[PDB]
Design a protein around this nucleic acid. Sequence first.
DNA 1: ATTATGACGCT
DNA 2: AGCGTCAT
Length: 430
Amino acid sequence: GPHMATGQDRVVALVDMDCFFVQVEQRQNPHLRNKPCAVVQYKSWKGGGIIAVSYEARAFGVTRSMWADDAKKLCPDLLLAQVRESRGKANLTKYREASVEVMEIMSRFAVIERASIDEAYVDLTSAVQERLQKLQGQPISADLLPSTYIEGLPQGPTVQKEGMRKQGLFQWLDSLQIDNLTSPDLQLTVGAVIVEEMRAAIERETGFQCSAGISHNKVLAKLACGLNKPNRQTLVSHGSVPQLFSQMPIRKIRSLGGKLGASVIEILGIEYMGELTQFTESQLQSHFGEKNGSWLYAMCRGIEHDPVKPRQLPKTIGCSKNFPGKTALATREQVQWWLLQLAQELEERLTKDRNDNDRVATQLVVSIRVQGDKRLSSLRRCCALTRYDAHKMSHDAFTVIKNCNTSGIQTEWSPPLTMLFLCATKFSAS
DNA sequence: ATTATGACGCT
DNA sequence: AGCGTCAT
Ligand SMILES: Nc1nc2c(ncn2[C@H]2C[C@H](O)[C@@H](COP(=O)(O)NP(=O)(O)OP(=O)(O)O)O2)c(=O)[nH]1
Ligand SMILES: [Mg+2]
Ligand SMILES: [Mg+2]
């Protein structure tokens, strides 16, 4: 009753750039704008692997993880942009720099948590309180929410999508109690006003469009962001959760799309998020552990407490390359040359990071995969990172991995290596 | 032969 | 510390 916490204490948004790498390439090359187009890495094997797809191309069935030659079967007029190659490998610097552009704009409105190259969570609780004091009990006009959907509305007592969006928004606004400065629904609405402004600023100042979700926590904001893409934002209220979750497959919730979500489905014999409400917190803890169990018990009621961490910068800086099938590295000279190429890219990125961000990495993590292992990493070893020098880092990485070489011969490497990965970690202020 | 990342939990 | 999971 009155003591049952409802998880309505915060306003959290999730902003995700639409088809990011595609948008970066479309800004640079106007010939690609408003076209079916995709971004690929490499080219010789099956035309390269697609990693980003414009919404026009998605209409033809083009998806990430598809080979470009196969995508061209679905969409013969598909336009392609290739990721830059440097030192023999894909180099994603252009997209990391575009990411910094967007995150610096977002940081003007609120503290952000960088969740990925193109997505960030935003804690808007304080900004909403501020705007509410400025509003002085003034109602919120639909004109302030020109790209907002209200999930679950319209309901009750009409043909085109924009008209639907507007009917739902009018139903939502008409039910608002703009008197109460602590009304959670009002707080979410003001949060959506602020996110409209932030998304407008991103587009004005970068050219990039994004989608967003506004709710009371990170998981609901992420789910909301996905409901109306591209170039739109969605408000998921606490009250919308029972209906939304009643037909939501468990795998759609962040963190349940893998083995744990499959175990929830199989152990409990359920399909949808809402079905979780019928179990006690102790029941869920018994099957999934104390942490997961408490998290599921709260999450299926729309409640989640994970804070938006004040972290705009990545925690690690890493360089990785796969050597699939017959390109695997089978000589010591090969392994050394590629460790050196990865280390030269890492040194470049680390030196720029130190100049921009006043910090230095202190640990080097070396990961490899050997032929025949189905795991991502076959072996992971750390060593000290005391100087931003590529020949030093590559020699140190070789020293920490050289014992994996089964070959009695000094020149050969067996079993050959199908992946190398260098990662700088454990940053300290400098 | 999906690839290049990045976060975080477990023990 | 090193390994596994989740994402994408
Ligand atoms: N190197 C690499 N980059 C990737 C990979 N997957 C994605 N990216 C890059 C390319 C993506 O542009 C970017 C952001 O990933 P999303 O937010 O998951 N996809 P997007 O923004 O394209 O579409 P949406 O409108 O649905 O949000 O990360 C990958 O496997 N490898
Ligand atoms: Mg995106
Ligand atoms: Mg994203």
